[PDB]
Amino acid sequence: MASMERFLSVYDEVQAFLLDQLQSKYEIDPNRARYLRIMMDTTCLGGKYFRGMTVVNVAEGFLAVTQHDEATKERILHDACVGGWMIEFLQAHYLVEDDIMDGSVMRRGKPCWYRFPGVTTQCAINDGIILKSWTQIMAWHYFADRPFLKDLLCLFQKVDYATAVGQMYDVTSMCDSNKLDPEVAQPMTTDFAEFTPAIYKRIVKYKTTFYTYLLPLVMGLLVSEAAASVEMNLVERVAHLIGEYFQVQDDVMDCFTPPEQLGKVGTDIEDAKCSWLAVTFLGKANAAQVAEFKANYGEKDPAKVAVVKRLYSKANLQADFAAYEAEVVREVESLIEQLKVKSPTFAESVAVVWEKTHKR
Amino acid sequence: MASMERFLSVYDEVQAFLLDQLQSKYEIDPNRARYLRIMMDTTCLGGKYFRGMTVVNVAEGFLAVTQHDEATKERILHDACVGGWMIEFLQAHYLVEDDIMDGSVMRRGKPCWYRFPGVTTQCAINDGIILKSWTQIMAWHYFADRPFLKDLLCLFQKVDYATAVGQMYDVTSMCDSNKLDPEVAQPMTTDFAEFTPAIYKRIVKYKTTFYTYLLPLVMGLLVSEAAASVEMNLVERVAHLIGEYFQVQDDVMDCFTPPEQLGKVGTDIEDAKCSWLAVTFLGKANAAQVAEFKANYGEKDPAKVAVVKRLYSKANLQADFAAYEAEVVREVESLIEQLKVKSPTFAESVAVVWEKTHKR
Ligand SMILES: O=[N+]([O-])c1cccc(O)c1
Ligand SMILES: O=[N+]([O-])c1cccc(O)c1
Ligand SMILES: [Zn+2]
Ligand SMILES: [Zn+2]
Ligand SMILES: [Zn+2]
Ligand SMILES: [Zn+2]
């Protein structure tokens, strides 16, 4: 059975289980069950399932080289699908809440969930909470008897926490750290001294890399009972490298990819985000260019946004991106070679993850 | 050592552990650590600690009748304090998010967290997420080696999920169920047919009773390794009775307790909430009174709110509350007697919980 069809079939199974349990144990009525079914479909479906399918693909790699009964292969693949959906539902939680936090308009070609007429922010904040709860309901039901349950839940909660910490780093990245204060309204930085590579790398590591790359790779190892057969420091290092490249791509697309293709209007400039474009521009600009950037960044005024995008263009940041990409290729290939010492099979799964990321 | 001082000392310990770990493992800087320290204090402190201290008091009851080394007594009480703070932090999560969802102005005499000038909704939604994450970070750290970890985490997540489901029941309680639809903006009910005792009881059971009464009582049993020594169906039944009374009190206070004493301005009438007052009024009103209620309920117009409060007064609902209270006393005393068959010690802890609730 092809992997994607198995993954989608398991979605239907998990949805049916969750909604039936709401009826049998939480006294839910049919109309609220329908609302939650639509909420689940709208928030969890429609992406590429990169994260969830990485769990399945890692598990498939070990199945190809490991002796198992057929029923065990089926069990492991079912577990990989459930675990993949745990990650997809975690992402769905963060996208629902982040779109509210940021006042976002569109996602995946459609209105953000909180903007649906019958949802509103009052319901959507709680819907996001339910999405996160469902990740745990899934795990306890499907993995109740599994040897990896404790490790999986502990990993999942640390990744969730890291992601929340990363969200804090992201939403505060345009303020001066020494002025953070719940009592005082926060002004945007004027000096942009905290727009550095090291600070950017911290934002991305926590806000994206743990849940997008580390969690799927390690969950795939756990459902395969294969974690002891890799060097976990290498898994972390390669996750944090590929995840950074993934975010840099997304940063470049926020500014330069046409909205029809991105699925939304990018607003990183207006939001004064610490993006790869802004850090790299500030790393090569002259004084006059720095001053013009400062005079126009972080403003909803479209003329000011056009100034910034013009500065980025004239700064030939496409050349910095090519240099950055070539260095990532060097380092990822090096880490893949190191992974081969202990697990050639896992190294190949990582190579696939990199290829998919590099060519998306 | 008095119980409350132990509980407050453990708060300081848990805070220090969480903030130190953010520094040592999550690369946090001092100013963001300070922001999170202030957020923790502002959202988690200042209440009565009823829920957290119930864990401690249940554990203390078993310590008085169970043979243990002194070091074991200290361990059990420390665990009860950590578990109590898990519940207090869970409540803090829900209060932060609910105040945003509802547009609330004040809580506990102070502005709601999202209204602090240096917070804003963008940060406060994520701060609430962090509060919930911290409940799990606490558990995994302090309870790593404990026999009750699996049961405790499974109970905690089911109670969390129930609470989110209850929030859904609450925020949708003024709409007609058959018209719920993410695609269509939701009108307030005109017939109030779903303002019934059974529907009210479902809202309260899920939104309040599981985390306010069931979770502290059972967590106290788990850290005492005493759950097998009670009839769990009775624990559930008595939690759902006392929790309903607690909410009915809060509903009456929303309408009639002066804001200086309540800590906020009550808005249940303007918000068209399915409150005990509205259900009980609709259960005894004549046709003309029903019509006047319908013409004025669910409106921010202060004159319409005064109409409703006048209808409540003239309806002598204080007599319904006295009748309701007398019936709760009958049923709680009956359940306490039944709890004595297997655990006279636990029955006494429940009697204390009831006394504190009844007299607050
Ligand atoms: O492009 N991605 O986002 C991606 C590709 C492959 C795996 C993964 O977890 C994420
Ligand atoms: O009044 N309360 O909210 C209360 C009293 C005693 C225990 C408890 O969990 C809650
Ligand atoms: Zn965001
Ligand atoms: Zn972006
Ligand atoms: Zn509310
Ligand atoms: Zn209330």
UniProtKB/TrEMBL annotation, chains A, B:
Binding-site list for Zn(2+) 8: D250, D254, D268
UniProt key word Metal-binding: yes
Any one Gene Ontology molecular-function term assigned to this protein's record: metal ion binding
Cofactor: Mg(2+)
Residues that, per the record, bind Zn(2+) 7: D250, D254
Residues holding Zn(2+) 1: D98, D102
Signal sequence segment: none
Keyword Transmembrane helix set for record: yes
Binding site for Mg(2+) 4: D250, D254
Binding site for Zn(2+) 3: D102
Residues binding Mn(2+) 1: D98, D102, D170
Binding site for Mg(2+) 1: D98, D102, D170
Binding, Mg(2+) 2: D102
Binding site for Mn(2+) 3: D250
Binding-site residues for Zn(2+) 4, renumbered to this chain: D102, D170
CC annotations in GO: cytoplasm
Protein name: Farnesyl diphosphate synthase
Part of the whole protein covered: 64 to 423 of 425
